[PDB]
Amino acid sequence: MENDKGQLVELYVPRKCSATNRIIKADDHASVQINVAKVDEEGRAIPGEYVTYALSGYVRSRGESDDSLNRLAQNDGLLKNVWSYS
Amino acid sequence: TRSSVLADALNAINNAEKTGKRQVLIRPSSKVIIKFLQVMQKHGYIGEFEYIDDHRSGKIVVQLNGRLNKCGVISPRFNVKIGDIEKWTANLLPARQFGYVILTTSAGIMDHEEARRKHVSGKILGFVY
Amino acid sequence: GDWITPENLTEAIIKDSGEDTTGSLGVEAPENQVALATGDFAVQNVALQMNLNLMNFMSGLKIKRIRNYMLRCHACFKIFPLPKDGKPKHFCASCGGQGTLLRCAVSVDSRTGNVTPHLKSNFQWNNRGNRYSVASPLSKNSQKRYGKKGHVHSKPQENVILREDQKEYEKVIKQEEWTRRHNEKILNVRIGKGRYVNSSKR
Amino acid sequence: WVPVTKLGRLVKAGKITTIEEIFLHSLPVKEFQIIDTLLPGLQDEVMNIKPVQTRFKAVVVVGDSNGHVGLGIKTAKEVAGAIRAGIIIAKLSVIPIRRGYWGTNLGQPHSLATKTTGKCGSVTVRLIPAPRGSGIVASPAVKKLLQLAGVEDVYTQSNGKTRTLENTLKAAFVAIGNTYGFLTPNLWAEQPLPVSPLDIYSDEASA
Amino acid sequence: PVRGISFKLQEEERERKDQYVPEVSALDLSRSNGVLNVDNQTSDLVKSLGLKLPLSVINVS
Amino acid sequence: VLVQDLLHPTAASEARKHKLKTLVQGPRSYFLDVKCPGCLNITTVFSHAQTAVTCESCSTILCTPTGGKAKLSEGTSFRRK
Amino acid sequence: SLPATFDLTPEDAQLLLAANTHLGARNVQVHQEPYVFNARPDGVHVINVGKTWEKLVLAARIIAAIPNPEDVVAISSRTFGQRAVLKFAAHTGATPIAGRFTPGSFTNYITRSFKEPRLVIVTDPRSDAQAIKEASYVNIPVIALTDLDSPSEFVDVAIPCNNRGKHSIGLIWYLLAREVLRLRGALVDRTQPWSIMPDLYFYRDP
RNA sequence: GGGAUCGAAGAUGAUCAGAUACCGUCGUAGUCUUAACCAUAAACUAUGCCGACUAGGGAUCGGGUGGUGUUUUUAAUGACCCACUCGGCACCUUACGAGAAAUCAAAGUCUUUGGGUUCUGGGGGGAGUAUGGUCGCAAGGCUGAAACUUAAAGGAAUUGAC
Ligand SMILES: [Zn+2]
């Protein structure tokens, strides 16, 4: 993906699922990307500031999507006590 | 009638990886299993792992990070001469420049590239990529 | 039992409506300027708590207190009048609970105007059939069973009734009325799965 | 043209300029004019026509010899009609291909990066990287698909009833698509996730 | 009215009909003697969250 | 489901598993101190005893075997040891 | 994290209890065994209303991120939900669909109903399954109100609540509208109650 | 030895009639049992045995543990109810998967091809024939060809003439 002179020779570098590290192919039309608004200290949403997650079609089809997103959001500040490790 | 404790362990890891789990438990352990996992860990295919004592051959819990495509065992443990190593890598690995074949030699357990630097051979165990 | 005879027939027919033909059934008890004699508990219920006068037409005495039956949902504890077909509705109109309406003994007083239920103190709950496997509409298995012919208008890929306002439910209630009228003049359905859903049927 | 879909409007307005954006965000494509403008060098080949009872079934491959290929099948009542509609379907299916080196990384990729397989019906097709100057070692029908994709050296093996022509092309098409699915150690690095263009230009795309 | 037909003398009424709101909310505890009737397990939930509410407890048993 | 702690199971979920399938094996039987109504002599009894244990002082019987736990006789008193 | 002013207030708690939103009924799926606090002896399960609040704010923060509001679609085929979604789409800028969904509304351009949503909000994932399925063909994320019996395929954010009672459905849509208007500048302060009564969202039969 | 019933064979009645077109009567061997033979069946789940993993729910049969539970009675036990667990005949849901498809908790963990081990097949006929051997009182069982001949025979699933 680099040639001998050190030049990049990929077309593009794919996105990877934040739940499972799988590559998201160019035709996985079931995959989605979620944007969560950042919140100002006066309690109002700031325009154009996001926390972002990506999920593969495999996870969504299997019904794990909601549980995975609770875990990710809770190790960021977005949730308090929804998810439990045990 | 467990004929191979090593074969069971790598089979459990494959099935967990395919379904997307982040951890797996394997029973029993052995010296050979520990050595095999340490090689996989060195090259970054797995996280940390932990051994549980029970006075009865113990258990292992392994953390999985999503990088592993396949691991597997070759049975029987065929004898391999230094000139033969090039044939096994052509058959088993998906490309010329990543993945490993794993050998037991009287110098220890190691991947096929270290065996070339040290110039040793022995018997085949398995593969990782 | 009791013999039905061609003289008694009209009274028996009224009894099968649920109306009290005997008078004083369940009776527990500006002057007398009006009184009402009636045998229907639904009318009696309204009369008592508005502080109307009810006449025991079998005996000539005013009624102060009576006991009868009404429905009570054991989920939300709300009370409902017993419908004239004499059995519970499938859904609670308040909380939407399914099958939670139980018939309950009730007393009414002119004095207080309040309504009091009477509860069996040693009630044992039955929980048979509350939980069972049910198909999902978006499973790969379901999409294969759905077939290639689109919507089949005969045997219509049946979907179970689980909500009060599900459009499938609207059909059955009106169609039930139609079949009733047709059959009665010419002579002139169940929902959920029941308690035993988890036992295999050959 | 007068684009009807939201993505078509951004393309005609010139806000999106390479097809790599569309692949990166995995967006659906509905209007063939989108491909027709982002990827003008595309050329087509007609693989088979046969009469059926009368109707005509046509199999069409399109690509440019530089990393993009597509496949399409159509039945129509006229020979010219089947080819015409066949090309439209093939343009909509375009997908990217990952290609690499058989050995040391001198001077531009020339082969596939890994072994890949695809299956359709009974037929299975397997592709293996090859050293430089081998050419494409494949049967004539599969050879043409790999040329339009822009592969130079590759070995192939196959199994099943390869004489059913369209199952063979579909199986090969699946195999080259899988090249971007395989994670390899140079892709282990971590990336920030881009913002979608349908966000940035939301007011250009509407109405 | 009939299906598939509409005219101003309906449209004007429908927009009036659906603006209806009662004078006192159906959720107001004033309708329920100032208390909430709940089971034992419900009052356990409240305590776990903290808070303090005018609950009334039925045994259910 | 996909992520869970296999090394620190909760005490409640551990208590309900079969004795061989907990993270580490162990018994769930125990021993008792037992006294007959007459004598002062305490004796130790295994909770799943198979024999009909007598007192030491005399041939009065303390327990009888069953398919599971042993049945202690009437009038005896016991303490879990 | 969001400041302490976002904690569940005692006044809102009374509303949730009065509407019976905590009654989860029976036939619990194996997913969503979280969100369950305990079971009664009669067999009804108590939903952890504290988690309902947490997830509802998270959903509001997702809706507030959308660049322009008509790109949000709210859907309810069932009749008890219809007035609620119509009111929701009036106070926010969202687009309502009430009644029959007509298949091929996110696929199949050259349809009178053709739309390109950025986000979909569904009132019942079993009855609205046609809308959920079609969203999965075109990379649209989904928010759903879910009871403990709801299937879970392709839903990304579940809000756990009683999904059957007329008041429960109306109250949840009401609270969402309040939260999005209050994350935007449309309501000036979180401390003062909103002037619109919940009853405006309730179903009205006769 | 026994011999009720039914009933290969056999002896007889009618030979007419297209739904009832194969029917009626008598009856030997047999059907049951004791002592020896025989070794076949669509002997079928048309699915070899041992071991690990990928999956969840409540019904039922056997055992065990807990409950301030109901009834028998003033305890124990018995019957019943709720929760949990080991083992079994099945069912419903689910598809990372598999397959030509019908379909499949194994028929999955296989071109990303290796857990241990036994048996069988190699286009359709000739043919389970001929010949040799071996077992059996016999009927027959087990093992088992070639010359020659032929372009198909076969599986699953679609649509629908007169
Ligand atoms: Zn109710």
Residue numbers in the entry:
A (entry chain a): 1 to 86
B (entry chain b): 2 to 130
C (entry chain o): 221 to 249, 261 to 419, 444 to 457
D (entry chain R): 35 to 87, 96 to 249
E (entry chain C): 65 to 125
F (entry chain f): 2 to 82
G (entry chain P): 2 to 207
Sentences from the paper on this structure:
The global Enp1TAP_A map resolution was estimated to surpass 3 Å. In addition, all r-proteins (except rpS26/eS26 in the platform at the 18S rRNA 3’ end) binding to the SSU body, including the S0-cluster r-proteins, as well as factors previously observed in yeast early cytoplasmic SSU precursors were found at their expected positions (Rio2, Enp1, Pno1, Tsr1). Several parts of the 3’ major domain which are thought to mature at later cytoplasmic stages were still found in an ill-defined state. These included helices h31, h34, h40, and an incomplete and distorted ‘neck’ helix h28, the latter resulting in an immature head-to-body orientation. The active center in the PIN-domain was observed far from its substrate, the region around the 18S pre-rRNA 3’ end. The obtained density map for the Enp1TAP_A state also allowed to trace the rRNA precursor backbone for 4 nucleotides downstream of the mature 18S rRNA 3’ end into the ITS1.
Structures of SSU precursors isolated from yeast S0-cluster expression mutants or control strains were analysed by cryogenic electron microscopy.
